[PDB]
Symmetry: C4
Subunit: 31 residues, 4 copies
Amino acid sequence: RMKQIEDKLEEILSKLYHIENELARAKKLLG
Amino acid sequence: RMKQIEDKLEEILSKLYHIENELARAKKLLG
Amino acid sequence: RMKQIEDKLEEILSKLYHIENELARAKKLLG
Amino acid sequence: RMKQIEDKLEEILSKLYHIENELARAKKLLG
């Protein structure tokens, strides 16, 4: 399916945002 | 191709989980 | 949809570059 | 295009591998 695609994209992108948050934490803990 | 597209989407997803896990461990080491 | 698929692929890509940059800076802070 | 898709997937995945390498460095620098 083509939406199914787009679906998975949306999820992948979601993970990326979280990773970006997780990196913001780690940069702060590094002073 | 769509199967391949579908396989690579999962692969991307499983790397993301791996990455989020690596980063999770670093965040807590730095703790 | 294909345009949207195409837009989200780029978005994913630009986050990846951002992430690789964050991580690049942490690797060198730790240096 | 559907290959164009798959194409971008391949690139995204490539970035993920590198990110994984970059994280392996950073975990080593963290002892």
